[PDB]
Amino acid sequence: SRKESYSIYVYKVLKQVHPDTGISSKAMGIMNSFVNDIFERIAGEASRLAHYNKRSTITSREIQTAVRLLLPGELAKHAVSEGTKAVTKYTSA
Amino acid sequence: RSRKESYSIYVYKVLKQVHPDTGISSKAMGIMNSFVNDIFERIAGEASRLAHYNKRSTITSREIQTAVRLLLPGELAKHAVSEGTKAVTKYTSA
Amino acid sequence: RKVLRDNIQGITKPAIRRLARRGGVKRISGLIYEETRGVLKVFLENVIRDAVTYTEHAKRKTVTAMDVVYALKRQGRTLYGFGG
Amino acid sequence: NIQGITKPAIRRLARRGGVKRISGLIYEETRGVLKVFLENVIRDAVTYTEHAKRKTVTAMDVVYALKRQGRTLYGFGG
Amino acid sequence: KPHRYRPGTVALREIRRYQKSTELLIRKLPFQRLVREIAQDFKTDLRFQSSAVMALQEACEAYLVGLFEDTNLCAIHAQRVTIMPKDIQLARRIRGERA
Amino acid sequence: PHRYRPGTVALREIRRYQKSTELLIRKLPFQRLVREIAQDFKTDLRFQSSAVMALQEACEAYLVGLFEDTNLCAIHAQRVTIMPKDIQLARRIRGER
Amino acid sequence: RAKAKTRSSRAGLQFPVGRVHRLLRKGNYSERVGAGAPVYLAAVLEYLTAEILELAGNAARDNKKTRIIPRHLQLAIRNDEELNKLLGRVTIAQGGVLPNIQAVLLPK
Amino acid sequence: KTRSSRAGLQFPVGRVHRLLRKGNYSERVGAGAPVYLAAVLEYLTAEILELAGNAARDNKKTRIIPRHLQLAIRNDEELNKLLGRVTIAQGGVLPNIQAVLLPK
DNA sequence: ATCAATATCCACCTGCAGATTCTACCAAAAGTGTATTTGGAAACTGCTCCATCAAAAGGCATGTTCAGCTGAATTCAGCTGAACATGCCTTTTGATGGAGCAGTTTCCAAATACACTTTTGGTAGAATCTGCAGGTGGATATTGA
DNA sequence: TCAATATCCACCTGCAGATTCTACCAAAAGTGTATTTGGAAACTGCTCCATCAAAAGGCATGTTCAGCTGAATTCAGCTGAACATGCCTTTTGATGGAGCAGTTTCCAAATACACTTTTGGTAGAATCTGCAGGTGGATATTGAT
Ligand SMILES: [Cl-]
Ligand SMILES: [Cl-]
Ligand SMILES: [Cl-]
Ligand SMILES: [Cl-]
Ligand SMILES: [Mn+2]
Ligand SMILES: [Mn+2]
Ligand SMILES: [Mn+2]
Ligand SMILES: [Mn+2]
Ligand SMILES: [Mn+2]
Ligand SMILES: [Mn+2]
Ligand SMILES: [Mn+2]
Ligand SMILES: [Mn+2]
Ligand SMILES: [Mn+2]
């Protein structure tokens, strides 16, 4: 049947930063694990945030506070900018 | 008017059952409430994961049971499982 | 309001000795007191930082005991006795 | 079976661990720790197996086990 | 005489005394100023429920006491009875609190 | 008639093993230990080969991590040789004991 | 119309089955929640609070008190291997620690 | 006309949205949440690939393998902290020998 | 082996802070009747998991030195505990003003629910390459003398 | 230092296990078209959170003094490291067969909705009442001699 993964997306991102670099299958597995793990942590924290505040919906606001709580310093700053940038560019054109 | 629930009433009933003569300070009751809420979260959380890994959308007594075996050590698990099972078979006996 | 400075020195040599005692410590080097303050400081900043983040997310100006409880839970430092 | 985990293999692990000199007693001590570690993870994995009514332990069962034992492992489905 | 207990005797009496009780060991007002100072450096204009400050003190003290037990095991392991900064560092290292 | 001094080869191996990533425990013996332990929890089990590999990866990374903390404990006692008491102390501080 | 029976009494429990059922549905644990789940969970929770109240009540007795306080809860948790493991990363406010002095520290 | 191209991302906003709704995180999911989350996941991914790529280049190789992901992560303070309790299978460890153990 | 200096240890009191019952009012469990949906049975299908050899091939198990590390013994210099005198500043009580948490009440964006339409991944092949694993040769790093 | 024994480090080379690159085609993901409903404003009750004021004694701060603990130094066993030497489990590969993880439809049983009706629980409001101190003689405990 079908088993979906982030492979095609990790790969497209690989070409942006290193057009000439490839990646082994095992390393791709590592990246998939990574995306899934970080996805769960952010989502999990956003979930608690909304529950603590008695809110039924997870907005970009809960995702942002969750990122702030989970990522160490500089990573949080950049992650936060990358995220609000994508939300504005998506709410525009 | 503002009103909030807690497991205090039940903790107190259970306390009288095991120690009829013993009371409990409010600070101790506060700790018992954190405890119940905490274990509820660990069990429910583990049950949620279990159901999700098995593409099942419903949490049944079977999920609560596996979560219990994963979370509690040896004897505590055995006894908890027994009590839970006995309460379910009884509950369903109408 | 008055300026808050050097309050980490409010954690005295005797208070730290007491904590070591409860921790079972019999003899303490003269350098333990400054190390302890530094360690306490790092511990407190990390918990305060998370607690205040929950406070701001709720749009409050008051850090609640629950903000601190959630912050301690995040850091694998679950605390029983103050709600939640 | 645990004796199959040999002195030289344990030495290799220690070396990657940056260890220069090893005491004669470390070998049996190491086997005991490795056994507790395997028992705890496998017990958890099999519990996931049995819950899914399977007779085959999958990598995902192991991955979920390691995850709750606070030993998250990347590269096998998570 | 004057009477004098030998070094280590009072220390042991103190351990028995503090391991026997549960009251906070750090003065309350000083600890509250420390909390307010640290907090103020993160976000200005903050207020605190009094129980929030107490939750923090209970946590910091349980944390320091737990750390001293581990520090103590590191001193004994070096065949010492006196804890030193390097024992605290070794414990924090193994506890994964730092590299 | 040439011999390296004790420790010289030990250091060489550290350099070699810290440089590689291959599994250091023999595969078959490991698979055997795994199946045995598993049999005590549920009989007649099968294992995806990748299930056995994940277990060996996790288990070998754990022991390597443990040996580093054990080493720090031996050095703290001003020794250069790791002993059971070093592993015990590291596990106690980690909260595994 | 029909005799109102609590799910708790039907289950033979002191803990609240209805409440627990509600907490399950509203915690986003799953889309659906089976009827037996809240019964099984209320029982496990009740069993566990009975176990620690039994041990805490005894620590209270030993210290010659009739009222269980936090310290009593600590002594019961830390002196019991399984509860200690279950709550190994929890801190009980006002609980203090167990009396314990390393042998090497005593006078020879 | 996909949501990713609109948000200018390479990661799948549509899937992140679906994964959020079906993971039992909340009753409802805002439209911006999957966008934000997707961007965050993409950024972290680029950050690691960037450093692993370099680790590869410095090893005189063009294909990133696990070893490289390990070298990139353990040699970076923040990534190391974020993945402090994670093990990269086949990643091995950073070469490092305690001074006290050296000859002389 | 005996005290003398002090530090618990164990009962015996007794009026409060702080539990433990008391009542009302709901918020929210409990019925009933319906409309859906979940997820077990019984029946196959490829997958991929054990066995089974079947040899080699490292890799492990043994004794043989003996290098040098750990553990056992002193031996102090001076750190850090115990005891005291001083008097500072945390504690304990008591208001008080008012910042700011929670309530109720509206009420639009913004999200969910539903068919459709269109597009994007995942999958089973077909077409190459990044290095693994050797080679040979040239300085290195170690050691003994 | 010298001489030589093994270790590394290179630059180059060729096969081949993977990594890529192709060609479809059914599950998502994107549209449009109606509800639905959060959970922001908008006040606005009314908890607590700052902030003194004032007094009092529990404790923090310094200082003296010297016990005994943490270093330093010095060996002498012996325990581990380095090394051939010999053989035997582990590794490497195909079969070859079979247990068994997935789907495939059934649908009966269990759940998720809507009111509609009861109460078990949660606020304060009175009623108790464990003990937190407070004071004394046993009992020890320590440390000098
Ligand atoms: Cl030090
Ligand atoms: Cl030992
Ligand atoms: Cl059920
Ligand atoms: Cl949003
Ligand atoms: Mn400041
Ligand atoms: Mn106001
Ligand atoms: Mn396509
Ligand atoms: Mn090569
Ligand atoms: Mn509404
Ligand atoms: Mn003074
Ligand atoms: Mn002297
Ligand atoms: Mn000494
Ligand atoms: Mn008393």
Side-chain angles (χ1 to χ4, degrees):
Chain A
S1 53
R2 300 210 335 163
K3 213 308 177 307
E4 59 181 34
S5 94
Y6 289 105
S7 283
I8 178 182
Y9 313 104
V10 163
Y11 191 85
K12 290 189 302 185
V13 174
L14 171 52
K15 292 314 171 175
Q16 288 183 286
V17 304
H18 282 93
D20 61 332
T21 303
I23 186 169
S24 81
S25 240
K26 284 191 181 67
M28 182 56 95
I30 304 301
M31 298 301 301
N32 278 140
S33 283
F34 175 70
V35 176
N36 279 309
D37 176 16
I38 302 308
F39 176 99
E40 160 64 24
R41 300 191 205 177
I42 300 295
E45 187 65 62
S47 183
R48 296 170 218 127
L49 274 166
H51 274 301
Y52 295 160
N53 294 281
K54 311 175 193 65
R55 261 59 198 198
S56 49
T57 134
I58 298 294
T59 67
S60 57
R61 180 104 182 303
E62 284 65 55
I63 296 298
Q64 169 165 123
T65 295
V67 163
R68 192 79 69 182
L69 292 163
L70 292 155
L71 310 189
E74 211 60 54
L75 240 24
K77 322 314 161 197
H78 297 310
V80 161
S81 88
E82 276 313 311
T84 97
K85 171 186 175 187
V87 171
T88 58
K89 183 179 301 179
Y90 168 86
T91 293
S92 284
Chain B
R1 187 199 75 183
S2 51
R3 78 141 212 170
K4 38 233 61 175
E5 305 167 351
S6 94
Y7 291 102
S8 304
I9 272 178
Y10 319 100
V11 170
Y12 203 81
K13 293 176 181 293
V14 174
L15 165 59
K16 307 284 65 173
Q17 290 193 309
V18 304
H19 286 133
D21 58 308
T22 303
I24 185 169
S25 89
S26 66
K27 187 187 264 64
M29 186 54 92
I31 291 170
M32 290 305 302
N33 251 81
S34 285
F35 171 66
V36 177
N37 282 316
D38 181 6
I39 303 307
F40 179 101
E41 214 316 300
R42 306 190 204 179
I43 300 294
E46 182 61 37
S48 171
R49 270 164 245 140
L50 229 6
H52 186 278
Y53 306 157
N54 292 288
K55 338 228 187 193
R56 293 169 49 60
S57 60
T58 174
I59 291 298
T60 65
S61 81
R62 191 167 179 274
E63 275 72 40
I64 302 293
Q65 179 168 109
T66 303
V68 166
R69 291 192 179 299
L70 286 169
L71 279 295
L72 310 183
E75 285 314 302
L76 238 31
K78 292 181 178 62
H79 289 172
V81 165
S82 152
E83 294 255 275
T85 296
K86 180 179 68 185
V88 170
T89 63
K90 179 171 186 301
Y91 174 79
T92 67
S93 283
Chain C
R1 192 59 166 61
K2 186 178 178 183
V3 169
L4 288 176
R5 305 155 55 215
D6 217 24
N7 288 286
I8 188 67
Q9 286 300 318
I11 309 318
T12 72
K13 173 184 179 181
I16 296 164
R17 175 176 48 61
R18 290 196 286 275
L19 288 159
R21 292 294 185 248
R22 183 170 287 166
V25 174
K26 182 182 182 183
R27 207 161 179 280
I28 307 174
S29 153
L31 309 167
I32 278 296
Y33 310 110
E34 277 307 315
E35 278 292 295
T36 300
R37 296 196 180 88
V39 167
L40 165 62
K41 188 86 171 319
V42 163
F43 176 89
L44 250 190
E45 302 175 325
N46 296 344
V47 177
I48 299 284
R49 176 183 303 110
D50 282 1
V52 174
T53 301
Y54 285 109
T55 303
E56 287 192 77
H57 186 272
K59 277 315 197 75
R60 283 184 276 99
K61 292 196 173 185
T62 313
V63 182
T64 59
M66 283 316 301
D67 293 330
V68 174
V69 172
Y70 299 131
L72 291 162
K73 169 97 69 183
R74 277 207 76 256
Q75 320 226 48
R77 217 65 224 177
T78 299
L79 171 67
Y80 284 1
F82 293 84
Chain D
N1 288 306
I2 194 178
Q3 287 305 318
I5 296 198
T6 66
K7 166 171 181 173
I10 293 165
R11 306 254 302 179
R12 289 193 287 283
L13 290 166
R15 293 292 187 246
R16 186 171 280 173
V19 167
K20 181 175 183 181
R21 203 164 185 279
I22 303 175
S23 154
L25 308 167
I26 262 76
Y27 307 111
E28 272 315 277
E29 190 79 18
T30 298
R31 292 182 184 97
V33 174
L34 176 261
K35 182 156 175 284
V36 162
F37 180 88
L38 284 180
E39 304 180 315
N40 296 345
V41 177
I42 295 177
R43 177 184 294 111
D44 271 15
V46 178
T47 297
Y48 280 115
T49 304
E50 222 162 352
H51 184 264
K53 313 179 176 187
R54 289 189 269 90
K55 299 199 63 188
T56 314
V57 177
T58 64
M60 281 320 288
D61 288 330
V62 173
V63 171
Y64 291 140
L66 289 165
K67 183 164 187 50
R68 70 181 310 286
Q69 284 294 318
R71 304 293 319 175
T72 297
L73 170 69
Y74 279 4
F76 293 84
Chain E
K1 304 187 67 175
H3 196 278
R4 279 192 82 91
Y5 285 106
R6 293 168 67 203
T9 297
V10 187
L12 290 170
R13 288 215 304 272
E14 283 177 21
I15 293 170
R16 292 181 229 277
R17 171 195 168 172
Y18 291 119
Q19 286 193 343
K20 197 187 306 137
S21 56
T22 74
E23 81 284 20
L24 291 168
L25 303 178
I26 295 173
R27 285 302 120 223
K28 177 159 124 288
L29 175 57
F31 183 81
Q32 204 191 201
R33 278 179 216 131
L34 177 55
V35 169
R36 291 184 189 286
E37 176 180 309
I38 288 167
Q40 195 172 219
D41 288 328
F42 276 132
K43 211 303 191 323
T44 52
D45 296 357
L46 288 170
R47 294 191 146 212
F48 283 80
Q49 292 183 325
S50 70
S51 59
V53 178
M54 296 312 299
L56 284 172
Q57 201 173 339
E58 285 284 341
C60 292
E61 294 204 17
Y63 169 78
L64 291 182
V65 170
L67 181 59
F68 281 126
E69 299 166 337
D70 293 345
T71 298
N72 205 28
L73 287 177
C74 294
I76 305 303
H77 188 254
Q79 315 203 291
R80 284 185 277 100
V81 163
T82 310
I83 63 174
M84 301 171 68
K86 82 217 196 80
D87 303 314
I88 293 182
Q89 281 151 26
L90 174 65
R92 294 228 306 139
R93 250 256 220 194
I94 298 187
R95 281 179 163 214
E97 280 168 48
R98 114 287 209 309
Chain F
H2 186 289
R3 289 175 70 80
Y4 288 109
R5 297 197 176 186
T8 291
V9 185
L11 286 177
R12 221 151 68 210
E13 291 179 27
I14 292 173
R15 288 195 179 84
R16 171 196 322 160
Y17 288 118
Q18 294 203 327
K19 192 152 288 198
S20 53
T21 68
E22 24 73 2
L23 292 174
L24 311 174
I25 297 178
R26 284 68 69 279
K27 199 164 310 304
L28 178 61
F30 188 80
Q31 189 163 58
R32 194 183 296 146
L33 180 54
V34 166
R35 297 178 185 285
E36 174 182 66
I37 290 174
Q39 188 71 189
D40 297 357
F41 297 125
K42 179 63 179 297
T43 54
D44 189 43
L45 279 170
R46 302 176 94 77
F47 275 87
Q48 291 190 338
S49 77
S50 58
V52 177
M53 286 299 96
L55 284 167
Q56 215 186 319
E57 283 291 323
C59 174
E60 285 198 29
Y62 165 79
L63 287 169
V64 170
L66 188 55
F67 276 124
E68 315 173 338
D69 296 344
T70 298
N71 205 35
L72 293 172
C73 293
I75 295 320
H76 192 247
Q78 305 193 309
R79 278 182 281 96
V80 113
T81 313
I82 58 170
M83 315 185 148
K85 72 177 85 162
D86 298 317
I87 301 183
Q88 279 153 30
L89 180 64
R91 288 192 69 233
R92 196 128 148 49
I93 308 311
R94 279 171 171 218
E96 293 175 23
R97 249 181 171 74
Chain G
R1 46 285 190 182
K3 186 181 192 60
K5 278 275 190 299
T6 57
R7 294 199 263 165
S8 289
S9 50
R10 285 198 171 65
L13 301 175
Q14 301 305 112
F15 264 52
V17 176
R19 185 115 115 202
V20 170
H21 196 342
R22 183 197 93 226
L23 291 173
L24 283 185
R25 295 196 314 276
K26 298 214 174 189
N28 302 311
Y29 291 116
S30 67
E31 210 57 42
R32 309 170 104 254
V33 179
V39 168
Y40 200 120
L41 179 56
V44 162
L45 295 185
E46 183 179 298
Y47 162 69
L48 291 172
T49 108
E51 181 69 39
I52 99 85
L53 290 170
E54 181 62 7
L55 295 174
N58 294 336
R61 186 86 57 181
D62 301 321
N63 297 73
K64 303 220 181 61
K65 310 271 202 293
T66 72
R67 188 179 296 133
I68 282 164
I69 64 171
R71 152 114 304 202
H72 300 146
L73 292 177
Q74 252 291 265
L75 297 164
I77 304 300
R78 306 303 159 200
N79 278 307
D80 186 68
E81 243 196 297
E82 312 215 320
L83 287 167
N84 185 59
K85 208 323 174 182
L86 177 66
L87 302 170
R89 305 232 74 237
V90 161
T91 139
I92 293 187
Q94 279 300 292
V97 306
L98 293 187
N100 181 63
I101 308 178
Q102 302 295 308
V104 177
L105 305 180
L106 303 177
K108 189 183 182 180
Chain H
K1 37 162 52 66
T2 70
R3 278 193 273 177
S4 297
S5 45
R6 230 188 291 161
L9 296 177
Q10 282 282 273
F11 265 52
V13 176
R15 172 179 294 184
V16 165
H17 198 310
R18 186 252 300 164
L19 288 174
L20 279 172
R21 296 201 322 277
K22 290 182 180 167
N24 293 109
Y25 292 115
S26 61
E27 175 185 347
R28 317 163 97 229
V29 186
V35 175
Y36 204 112
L37 178 45
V40 167
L41 290 166
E42 190 177 308
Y43 166 66
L44 288 172
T45 298
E47 187 66 25
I48 290 176
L49 292 178
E50 162 72 42
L51 304 170
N54 293 346
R57 181 190 173 203
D58 299 325
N59 183 184
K60 254 177 285 63
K61 301 203 175 319
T62 60
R63 182 182 298 143
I64 286 172
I65 61 176
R67 217 299 113 123
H68 305 145
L69 292 177
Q70 177 72 332
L71 291 181
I73 288 168
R74 303 309 166 201
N75 279 306
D76 182 75
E77 201 181 64
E78 306 191 327
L79 286 174
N80 181 58
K81 201 296 176 292
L82 180 71
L83 306 179
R85 309 307 309 310
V86 168
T87 117
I88 279 51
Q90 281 300 301
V93 314
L94 297 185
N96 177 49
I97 312 177
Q98 300 297 304
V100 211
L101 305 176
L102 296 171
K104 213 62 173 301

